[PDB]
Amino acid sequence: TQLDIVIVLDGSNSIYPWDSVTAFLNDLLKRMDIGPKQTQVGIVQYGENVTHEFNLNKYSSTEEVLVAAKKIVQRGGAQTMTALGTDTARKEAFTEARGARRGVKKVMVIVTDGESHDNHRLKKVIQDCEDENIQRFSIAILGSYNRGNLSTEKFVEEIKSIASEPTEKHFFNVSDELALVTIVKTLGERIFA
Ligand SMILES: [Mg+2]
């Protein structure tokens, strides 16, 4: 079965350098066969609000997706609304109106480097994602936290709660931005296999 993939990117300013995120997107995407009858990719960026960078059916080829992924700019933000960004991907990104197809497996990839301001909604948002059979891969970047000498225990536990089970398979603990690209092959093959 094919796959509708929606990448949800935290765009907060603490994430640096943005080139690491786009390099991560490029590497993950270039090894996919994007098409209306193949894999479809949609990308959403969130900070304090949410923005659909491009819908699931916006681009019909891998080359096109790559071009669009490289153009994504960091929108910034002072408070991380992960619940909002995730719920929106479920509510809007994954809709026929934006390209989502029938009889296709839905996959969400969440990338963030901080604890969410609306973490009180995560329980509900996630459960709704589960009821809709959306497989979730969450990635926590401990870069800004470590550099700020902040405790990452709760943060890791929170992003982990977003991941689908097993968990050790859907959750990725990334030490820093430059290390993002090192999970591409594993994540890549897991999204599919
Ligand atoms: Mg942040």
- Integer-rounded Cα Rg, in Å, for the chain is 15
Neighbouring residues of the ion ligand 1, judged by CB less than 5 Å: 12, 14, 113-114
* Dihedral angle sign, alpha carbons of residues 152, 167, 192, 34: negative
Residue with tokens 């669009």: 68
The per-residue b/e assignment along 92-108, b for 16 or more CB within 10 angstroms, e otherwise, is bbbeeebbbeeebebbb
Q: Is 98 strand, coil or helix?
A: helix
| Residue 165 DSSP one-character state | S
- Among 11, 20, 94, smallest CA distance to 50 is for 11
What's the CA-to-centroid distance between 153 and ligand 1, angstroms?
15
CA–CA gap between residue 34 and residue 13 (Å, rounded): 30
CB 59 within 8 A of CB 32: no
Quoted resolution (Å): 2.3
Q: Is 108 strand, coil or helix?
A: strand
Residue with tokens 């979730």: 136
What's the CA-to-centroid distance between 63 and ligand 1, angstroms?
30
| Residue 47 DSSP one-character state | S
- Among 34, 24, 4, smallest CA distance to 112 is for 24
Q: Report the CATH architecture of 1-193.
A: 3-Layer(aba) Sandwich (3.40)
- Give the list of residues 6+ apart from residue 185 with CB closer than 8 angstroms, or none: none
CA–CA gap between residue 30 and residue 79 (Å, rounded): 31
Q: Is 40 strand, coil or helix?
A: strand
Q: Is 7 strand, coil or helix?
A: strand
Determined by: X-ray
Dihedral pair phi/psi, residue 173, rounded to 5°: -100, 110
CB 38 within 8 A of CB 141: no
What's the CA-to-centroid distance between 107 and ligand 1, angstroms?
23
Rounded to 5°, the CA angle 112-116-117 comes to 145
Q: Is 188 strand, coil or helix?
A: helix
| CA dist 15 → 72, 77, 143, 178 (Å) | 14, 10, 8, 11
CA–CA gap between residue 173 and residue 182 (Å, rounded): 11
Dihedral pair phi/psi, residue 13, rounded to 5°: -60, -25
